[PDB]
């Protein structure tokens, strides 16, 4: 379970912004490995959780899950206050089977990335238009 | 039950700050000896309570307890009122037995102080990263 | 991270020293336990600290730290080093979720250096209520 400070390069509305993330420990309760943004407040920071799972006799499949939680908090007008306002969740959930090879798994991951870069999907998400 | 104005030296994020505390009376209801910070408002002041106890036939042990309650207020919210916003509790509870000597008791207290000064614990508390 | 941790200058007179090697996190509840190497399976002074995350019910961090150290007993014709008296001490903080770092550390430091002040020292060494 290796971790490191991960930089994210060319992510933004334009593609010029960069992001830095530092690791903040594996939670052994449910396998949740968290990464966070270097902030003092524990409730005003962008955070990214990732958790590979294991198959029991209940579900019998791998279940990879990635959550992203960006919370934008607005200015507090009076003097000094600061308060969280709105949330912006994000979820990714792969359901890879037992006998899958790594070629088709990487094919799914590359396909999801390239489809996130498509013009149709940024038409659907960034402007909230339905599909066309 | 002696009391005095207690100064706290080199407590802070850097270790340069000092604190002054003045005594504000033993409450005879439950043995709670309180110390406080010299403020006018009775709800915007850092306070430290300490209460040694006694053994009944119920629990049969000494039970020393120290509470610390720091509250940081926030200022104007469209009016000049200096109202309270957040609490920050702290609790310490020793459970010393009857036949304990003072060497092992002072060993526990010195151990707790030196472990509060360790780098691991300020990694865990000041940055909240789980260890 | 974890590390061998060594207490320095700690004791009744402060000349004693202590050292620990972590025994590893217990997965079930997250308790992280350090220990001081002592050969016996059970005479070891041990110290455990595990910090939670705000659950659905309460919403505020609750760092908690125990310290529990027992003691030995004499030979009874069988060498077993049995344990008699415990001496638990626990410390718990509960800062709310919006608190900044400066506030959080301040309380930690204060607790630590408060103990050195004589008022605490008489009470703890000597059980004479302040």
């Amino acid at each position: 379970a290796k971790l490191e400070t991960v930089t994210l390069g060319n992510i933004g509305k334009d593609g010029k912004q960069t992001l830095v993330l530092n690791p903040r420990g594996v939670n052994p309760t449910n396998g949740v490995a968290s990464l966070s943004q270097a902030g003092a407040v524990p409730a005003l920071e962008k955070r990214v959780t990732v958790s590979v799972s294991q198959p029991s006799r209940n579900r019998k499949n791998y279940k990879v899950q990635v959550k992203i939680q960006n919370p934008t908090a607005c200015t507090a007008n009076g003097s000094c206050d600061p308060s969280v306002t709105r949330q912006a969740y994000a979820d990714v959930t792969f359901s890879f089977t037992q006998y899958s090879t790594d070629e088709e798994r990487a094919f799914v991951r590359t396909e999801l990335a390239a489809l996130l870069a498509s013009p149709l999907l940024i038409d659907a998400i960034d402007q909230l238009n339905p599909a066309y | 039950a002696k009391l005095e104005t207690v100064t706290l030296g080199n407590i802070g994020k850097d270790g340069k700050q000092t604190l002054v505390l003045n005594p504000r009376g033993v409450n005879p209801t439950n043995g709670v000896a309180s110390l406080s910070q010299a403020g006018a408002v009775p709800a915007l002041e850092k306070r430290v309570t300490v209460s040694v106890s006694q053994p009944s036939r119920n629990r049969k042990n000494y039970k020393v307890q120290v509470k610390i309650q720091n509250p940081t207020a926030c200022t104007a919210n469209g009016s000049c009122d200096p109202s309270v916003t957040r609490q920050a509790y702290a609790d310490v509870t020793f459970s010393f037995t009857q036949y304990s000597t003072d060497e092992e008791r002072a060993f526990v207290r010195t151990e707790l102080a030196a472990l509060l000064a360790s780098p691991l614990l300020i990694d865990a508390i000041d940055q909240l990263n789980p260890a | 991270k974890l590390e061998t941790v060594t207490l320095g200058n700690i004791g009744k007179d402060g000349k004693q020293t202590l050292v620990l090697n972590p025994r590893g996190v217990n997965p079930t509840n997250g308790v992280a336990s350090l220990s001081q190497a002592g050969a016996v399976p059970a005479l070891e002074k041990r110290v455990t600290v595990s910090v939670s995350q705000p659950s659905r019910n309460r919403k505020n961090y609750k760092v908690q730290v125990k310290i529990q150290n027992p003691t030995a007993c004499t030979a009874n014709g069988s060498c077993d080093p049995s344990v008699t008296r415990q001496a638990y001490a626990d410390v718990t903080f509960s800062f709310t979720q919006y608190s900044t770092d400066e506030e959080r550390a301040f309380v930690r430091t204060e607790l630590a250096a408060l103990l050195a002040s004589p008022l605490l020292i008489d009470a703890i060494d000597q059980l004479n209520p302040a």
Partner: antibody
Amino acid sequence: VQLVESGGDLVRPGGSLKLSCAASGFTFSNYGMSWVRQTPDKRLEWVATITSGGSYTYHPDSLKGRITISRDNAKNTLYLQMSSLKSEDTAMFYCTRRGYYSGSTYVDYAMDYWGQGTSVTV
Amino acid sequence: IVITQTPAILSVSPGERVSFSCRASQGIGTSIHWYQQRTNGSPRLLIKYASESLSGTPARFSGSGSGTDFTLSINSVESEDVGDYYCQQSYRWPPTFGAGTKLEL
């Protein structure tokens, strides 16, 4: 201990500027600076603070949109982002330390180790 | 709070002491300071929290006062310790400083 800054151009009205100070001796992650403006005849007034982490940024109520502080912990410097300069509030700037704080409120405050000063003039 | 202080100018010989009267409009719980603006430089602390003297200050400086009217009561005016003595207050909301005071000989 040096706290030298440099942002001192002659700026047209309505414009904007950016100035920063370095710090030595003081470990920068440990503290939180604040700017203090000295009106160029005698008097003084507080500009804005920031905390130790850089999240909470405290302003005054008189000017709100004109000032934002960014804190750069990696290079021991903080940036004062000034925008929409009004006329006649051009004066020298200084950076404080937050050396000797107390009280419950954060902005109960003390100011040692002042800077050198850079003029801003319209 | 409007913090005022009464002497606009002052003159003493280098032997005689002098006090600087300051007055707060609303009560402040012993939370003011004192700064020492020299001629062509930057200020510095003299008196912390209206009574506590630092190590960087000279021992001649001394301040006192509780509740409303605060002052520093410098006991020996050593030559070329001159300038502009601003007052500052840290209660309420926006901290606001004093107007100014001269200390020529």
